[PDB]
RNA sequence: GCUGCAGUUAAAAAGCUCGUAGUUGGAUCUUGUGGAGGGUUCCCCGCCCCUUGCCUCUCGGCGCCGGCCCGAAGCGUUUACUUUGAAAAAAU
């Protein structure tokens, strides 16, 4: 939200589900934020760098979060587009 | 669903996307027309010519070898009948049930099925009368019906 | 079906399994074949779901019999499909 | 006679008299003398293709074209041998009639046949280019800018007769109709 | 029986969006459906789409982006005049700031904001937001 | 209750099927480059194939050194729809 002077007027901007493009509400206690370690390419070891995803509670309780986290990890380089 | 029954089955033909004649087919357009003209002399209706040609010769769809549907091919030589295929078979079915009911007046199922055939004759004749295939004065009658198929 | 399977590229084993009218584009399961018999050897063409009791050019009394599904051959030398 | 191409006033052009000379002189050797009979070619043109090279288009009248295709497999191979490294296509001389409803003069005394519609002509021109091979199916992609692309599927037999000409087919169909086309082979076909 | 094809196309998209599916298949295709989809795509509510030829009216596959709240049809194609269009957008839209009515007019199928620039009335087809 | 209600159990679906009038009815038949206003492609001119779709007169002014051109007319298959003109007491 902006006004005609171009300044912003929301209290905060809420996050959206990485699998589904829908807003995660302030009381969605079934939702999660996932965090995953990157590894260096010469020795397969943690360098302290990481990647993150957020998942809606409605997609978790129907059983679709495992396949959603897998598609996200194949779209990024982690699973390397072969299986 | 079916027009006079509770059934809703799905069986029908499914034509391929490719309209072309196949390279192995030895027949040609005017020899297919002569085979159609010979089979018509035996009194075969258009629906019977297409199965004899599909089963015993190479032609899967006559309309793809010869550019015309086979009732047109017979009409252009005057070989086609006056009363059309389906209306002939419906009228032939109604006279068989009427020969049953003259001696079996207790058969109340046969009485009910005759209403469902003759109301299907009336619906199909009303269609053909608007497209000029039949005279405007054409009428099915329960006394006359035996004379329509002689 | 998962949440994300693409509809434009069914595998041939997904397409061959389903009904002829419910495929992405329609196609028949029936075919044409060439058939040959003992005693007289002029080859002839037959449709696999025939309704006619076929007689060959070799004048044998039955080449095949009709049935509620595919027609059955009288132990003829070929059941070979034509390619197209 | 020679210079068989085009209506009156248009006829004398060097390129198009050159291609029609190269066609009509070929009946003089004993092999094509069996099957050519001075049959009409209505026009020809030489046109650019995407590789910076050239190709030729030959225009054939409709009741003659059913006889040309029966010998085209040898007749085009002889012409592509004789010309300077060119690619050749034969296409029909189809006419389009305008839309009768508020885009033409119209009356009850003659009706526009559906065989003379723009859609029935443009989708017939597509079958002429590919002739040694057969169309297995079409798809159309609509882009986010509102443009269209056509995807054509060609049969998997006879690849060797068309794979080296898909780059001229796109450029020829673009110049005959104004539309983008790609030519492709299927994963599998029933 | 099937009395109207545009109502099937939009009900089929609307049920697929609510299940969270990434694609949907529409059948039969029509000239009216392709022109309606194009208006939603140009405003950013759906992804790109592809048409399949089968020699029997055809089919469409559409890509979904998760932004669409609803799309729908008004079944009698009522006529509208520029003076009465305010009453229809007061009834059908969720806010004055977003969402669109779709009209058919002699200048084409279009967005109700374009019909005011072109100074034209028409018949109502549907809406989206 | 048109916008806008309800009918398993609270009031309420004809015992069942056919059928004339009434209401409703599947897909399909001509587009992108160039210029103005405006944008960075689309709305007005002229074009791949037709741009008022044709046509050739004759009573009747125009352009020029008789003949050839450009505004009426025959009219664009018939209607609904929509946008614009005209014409409708005052008082309220």
Curated annotation (Swiss-Prot), chain A:
Assembly information from the UniProt record: Component of the 40S small ribosomal subunit.
Family of the protein in this entry: Belongs to the eukaryotic ribosomal protein eS21 family.
GO MF, one example: structural constituent of ribosome
Segments crossing the lipid bilayer: none
Superkingdom, taxonomy of origin: Eukaryota
Modification N6-acetyllysine, positions: 81
Keyword annotations from UniProtKB, A to Z: Acetylation, Cytoplasm, Endoplasmic reticulum, Isopeptide bond, Ribonucleoprotein, Ribosomal protein, Ubl conjugation
Covalent link location (Glycyl lysine isopeptide (Lys-Gly) (interchain with G-Cter in SUMO2)): 41
Compartments reported by the entry: Cytoplasm, Cytosol; Cytoplasm; Rough endoplasmic reticulum
One cellular-component annotation, GO: synapse
N-acetylmethionine PTM positions: 1
Lineage, opening ranks: Eukaryota, Metazoa, Chordata, Craniata, Vertebrata
Role summary: Component of the small ribosomal subunit. The ribosome is a large ribonucleoprotein complex responsible for the synthesis of proteins in the cell.
Protein's UniProt name: Small ribosomal subunit protein eS21
Pfam families linked to this entry: Ribosomal_S21e (PF01249)
One example of a Gene Ontology biological process annotation: endonucleolytic cleavage to generate mature 3'-end of SSU-rRNA from (SSU-rRNA, 5.8S rRNA, LSU-rRNA)
Keyword GTP-binding belongs to the record: no
Keyword Membrane recorded: no
From Swiss-Prot, chain B:
Stated role: Component of the small ribosomal subunit. The ribosome is a large ribonucleoprotein complex responsible for the synthesis of proteins in the cell. Part of the small subunit (SSU) processome, first precursor of the small eukaryotic ribosomal subunit. During the assembly of the SSU processome in the nucleolus, many ribosome biogenesis factors, an RNA chaperone and ribosomal proteins associate with the nascent pre-rRNA and work in concert to generate RNA folding, modifications, rearrangements and cleavage as well as targeted degradation of pre-ribosomal RNA by the RNA exosome.
Any one of the GO BP annotations: translation
TM annotation in the entry: none
Xref: Pfam families: Ribosomal_S13_N (PF08069), Ribosomal_S15 (PF00312)
Record keywords: Acetylation, Cytoplasm, Isopeptide bond, Nucleus, Phosphoprotein, Ribonucleoprotein, Ribosomal protein, Ubl conjugation
Signal peptide: none
Residues with the Phosphotyrosine modification: 37
Mod. after translation: Ubiquitinated at Lys-26 by RNF14 and RNF25 in response to ribosome collisions (ribosome stalling).
Gene3D superfamilies xrefs: 4.10.860.130, S15/NS1, RNA-binding (1.10.287.10)
Compartment(s): Cytoplasm; Nucleus, Nucleolus
Top-rank lineage group of the source organism: Eukaryota
Gene Ontology molecular function: any one: structural constituent of ribosome
Protein name: Small ribosomal subunit protein uS15
Residue location of crosslink Glycyl lysine isopeptide (Lys-Gly) (interchain with G-Cter in SUMO2): 42
Organism: Oryctolagus cuniculus
Family: Belongs to the universal ribosomal protein uS15 family.
Swiss-Prot record, chain C:
Signal peptide per UniProt: none
Top-level taxonomic group: Eukaryota
Positions bearing Phosphoserine: 11
Cofactor: record remark: Binds 1 zinc ion per subunit.
Compartmental location: Cytoplasm; Nucleus, Nucleolus
Main location: cytoplasm
Residues in C4-type zinc fingers: 37-59
The keyword Oxidoreductase appears for this protein: no
Residues that, per the record, bind Zn(2+): 37, 40, 56, 59
A GO term from the CC aspect: small-subunit processome
Job of this protein: Component of the small ribosomal subunit. The ribosome is a large ribonucleoprotein complex responsible for the synthesis of proteins in the cell. Required for proper rRNA processing and maturation of 18S rRNAs. Part of the small subunit (SSU) processome, first precursor of the small eukaryotic ribosomal subunit.
Family: Belongs to the eukaryotic ribosomal protein eS27 family.
Subunit and partners: Component of the small ribosomal subunit. Part of the small subunit (SSU) processome, composed of more than 70 proteins and the RNA chaperone small nucleolar RNA (snoRNA) U3.
Name of the featured protein: Small ribosomal subunit protein eS27
Origin species: Oryctolagus cuniculus
Gene behind the chain: RPS27
UniProtKB/Swiss-Prot annotation, chain D:
Residues with PTM N6-acetyllysine: 70
Keywords, comma-separated and alphabetical: Acetylation, Cytoplasm, Cytoskeleton, Isopeptide bond, Nucleus, Ribonucleoprotein, Ribosomal protein, Ubl conjugation
PROSITE patterns per record: RIBOSOMAL_S7E (PS00948)
Gene Ontology MF annotations: structural constituent of ribosome
Pfam families cross-referenced by the UniProt entry: Ribosomal_S7e (PF01251)
Post-translational modification summary for this protein: Phosphorylated by NEK6.
Function of the protein: Component of the small ribosomal subunit. The ribosome is a large ribonucleoprotein complex responsible for the synthesis of proteins in the cell. Required for rRNA maturation. Part of the small subunit (SSU) processome, first precursor of the small eukaryotic ribosomal subunit.
Family: Belongs to the eukaryotic ribosomal protein eS7 family.
Name the UniProt record assigns to this protein: Small ribosomal subunit protein eS7
Organism of derivation: Oryctolagus cuniculus (Rabbit)
Gene name in the database record: RPS7
